[PDB]
Amino acid sequence: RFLCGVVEGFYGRPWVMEQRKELFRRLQKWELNTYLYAPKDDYKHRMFWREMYSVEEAEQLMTLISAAREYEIEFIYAISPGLDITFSNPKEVSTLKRKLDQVSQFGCRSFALLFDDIDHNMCAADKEVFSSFAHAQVSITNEIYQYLGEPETFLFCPTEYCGTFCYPNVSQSPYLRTVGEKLLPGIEVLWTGPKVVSKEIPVESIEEVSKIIKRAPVIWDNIHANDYDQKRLFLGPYKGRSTELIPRLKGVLTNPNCEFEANYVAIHTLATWYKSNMNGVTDVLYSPQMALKLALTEWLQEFGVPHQYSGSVTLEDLQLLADLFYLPYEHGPKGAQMLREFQWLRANSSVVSSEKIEEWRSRAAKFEEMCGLVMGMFTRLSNCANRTILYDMYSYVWDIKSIMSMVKSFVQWLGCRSHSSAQFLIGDQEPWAFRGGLAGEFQRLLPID
Amino acid sequence: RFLCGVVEGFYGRPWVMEQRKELFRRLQKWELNTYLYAPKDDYKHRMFWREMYSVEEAEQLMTLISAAREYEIEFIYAISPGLDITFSNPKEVSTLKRKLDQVSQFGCRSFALLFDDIDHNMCAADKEVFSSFAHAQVSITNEIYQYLGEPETFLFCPTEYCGTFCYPNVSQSPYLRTVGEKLLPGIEVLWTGPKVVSKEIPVESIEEVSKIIKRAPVIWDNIHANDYDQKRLFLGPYKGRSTELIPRLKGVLTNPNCEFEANYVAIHTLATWYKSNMNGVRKVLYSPQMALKLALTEWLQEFGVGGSVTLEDLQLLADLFYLPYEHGPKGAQMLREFQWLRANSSVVSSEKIEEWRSRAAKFEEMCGLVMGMFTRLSNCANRTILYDMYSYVWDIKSIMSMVKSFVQWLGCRSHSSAQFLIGDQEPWAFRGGLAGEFQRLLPIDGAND
């Protein structure tokens, strides 16, 4: 039993039920088998957890679970009470029991309770009754696990769910020691990696946290998570994770972008990565570039379902789009090539000599060709017939077009200003000082590398 | 008489029909009377305008027109033929006639021809039949206008509508002379301003346009439109417009933000500019500050069901996202305080450093006010208003917290190391993506020769 699926786990704009039914269709085509419902800004889930659903909310949740059971996807209703809860008071425990009982009647078999992004200080009665935070949380998890008759897949996310959040280490922390000692063995734990956003989840960190919890954890994976930076978007493949982590784990649950239609690659490459191996003890039987190419090919076929009726987008346009928006700690090959060409062009911009003028103007012409490629990419993407995918990522491609036009203008200005032929950079483009709207001003007034 | 209303005329995701009915309810509540439907990223309006409506969206447009007529708002179905239109081809004119005629059979009574961003001239036989491009546009506008038997309100938007678009000057341009002579009266024109964002439309620019168009223009407002960057919104007043423009104009149409729920303040302050100030003809009196206070009071009344949001939070929110050019008083105060502190940064922790610490204490207090504004706005009952503007308040929250940590490092500059915090966020994990990196590498005023 392996829990390979998608956790909705971001902040702000939760998905709609039609999007989740399309997600359940998408997982069943890709042989994935789980879905963890935990949207942080759904107000019946986090900010108010004592409040019960209405009749229409129960109906849409009931048909959501029915669509999941139709599509062989294990719906896991999670619930995060940790912002305001008295664990010592049994009234909050019984209210949580009532809420989990009402969601039991909607057809849910798998459940979870989540304790994330909360301060480590407790109440006065919680400090009076119980010794530490982890003892109270593991007593709540054991009480809910006994109250629901020990479900087959129950998930528990700790407050120190990554390597930076736990102190002093992953092994000397008293929190993970209490969690590993006092927990029932059928309850799977959640984990993220060395950070909240992990560049890599190495094998040895998984093995030492499997020592400290005495179980194989399920990695909540915020690789393509979009909630911390809403100016960014990630369309890279499922990289940074070795294929030998599958026998050392109980599940991989990816937390994708806040926009649903930008998540074809981020779930399909996870499906290809899970299809690499399933058992047995720079990567063997998995290439992230080949999984990225397969994801973009199937996504181009998704684009071609309405095609052009009611130029079209090509595969090279999608590859440029994925290379422009790749990873929280990486860019694409084309994006890094454009970065190093612009850094070269602004290096010797002030003094350019002969053969030096020849190579400068040739690489400036190559940069203008790449700028025309991104203009053609945006124009062919805006002429597509799948309108929902266009509306989900219109701000990002609009922002990269509106930046790259002025970058193309400044490279044309530098081509003018290599020789003494008057002009000004102000006369080429107006030097605006209001990008971001008092956020980019503070961002540019803050130091970078 | 006067066409004071809202043009839904941006790039991005167009609004759904139910929030358009909510918009019609708000326009009925604020004594506005117009709505210019022209969403530029719609696959039936701008591109593929020749395609007839389907058998499931025709009833949606019919119910939208009937909901407009219920609240006594003039639905103006604009159409943008200017992508691949052949003006001299009569079959294209017949397809345009059938397309407008099927909206005329949907109950729509006002129509508009829109010619934005088509300033490229005609070609082959199209360019030689007509003497100028404007002659072709006013001839097909007169043909459509007499085909419909002269409707009461018809709007012709040229491509030379911006003051910098008209070449040369305003009066010396041949386009505005051809439009002002060879177009029939009763077809009112659309004029944005001396700029495309229109910081200040004065009386004299309106006189210089009205002497060449021989009528009064209905003024387009991109004063709160965020379709050019989509990284900020605008909650400011209707600043930059004299009260005496109402007898010299035929209408004012406001293009608001692409997020619908952030448009309460801008449309309401337009309403307090019009219906509370000089409805009559009078050939300074409107206070933008009191209009902003009234708009924020009514928006606070919208915000109720209880997340305890106060009016100081909304004044702070409107000051954080204020105008395309200006900022709020509190936002400019925070920016000038932060640049004073980063200019007068203490080497170690007499007179200078004490005043520095006092201003740093006030700065961290108002940063905590920003945090309180976000955490009270996240607890509001009406979730859709939160979901529309979540990215902007999240961005300003995270940027304000990093700026507060940088001020905390600046208070102990000799003691602490690795700048603000070494937490693998020195590029803020490449904030903005490639758009942010190329924007920071653009020489606005830092590397400006």
Numbering used by the authors:
A (entry chain A): 59 to 339, 370 to 398, 551 to 593, 601 to 696
B (entry chain B): 59 to 341, 372 to 393, 550 to 593, 601 to 700
Pull verbatim passages from the article behind this deposition.
A construct was designed that lacks the large, disordered loop (residues 397–535) while retaining the pHAT domains. As with TaOGA, this hOGA construct was expressed and purified from E. coli, imaged by cryo-EM, and processed using CryoSPARC. Instead, these domains appeared as blurred density in 2D and as an elongated asymmetric density between the two stalk domains in 3D, suggesting that the pHAT domains adopt a range of different angular positions relative to the catalytic core. This analysis yielded four major conformations—termed I, II, III and IV—each separately subjected to 3D reconstruction and refined to global resolutions ranging from 3.3 Å to 4.0 Å. An AlphaFold3 model of hOGA was used to guide model building, and across all conformations the catalytic core consistently displayed a near two-fold symmetry, forming two glycoside hydrolase active sites composed of the catalytic domain of one monomer and the stalk domain of the other. In all four conformations of hOGA, the cryo-EM density maps reveal a discontinuity in the region following Leu701, corresponding to the linker connecting the catalytic core and the pHAT domains. This linker (LFFQPPPLTPTSKVY) is of medium length and proline-rich, characteristics known to disrupt secondary structures and enhance conformational flexibility. Unlike the crystal structures of hOGA without pHAT domains, all four conformations display additional density in the active site.
Nucleocytoplasmic protein O-GlcNAcylation is a dynamic modification catalysed by O-GlcNAc transferase (OGT) and reversed by O-GlcNAc hydrolase (OGA), whose activities are regulated through largely unknown O-GlcNAc-dependent feedback mechanisms. Here, we show that the eukaryotic OGA pHAT domain forms catalytically incompetent, symmetric homodimers, projecting a partially conserved putative peptide-binding site.
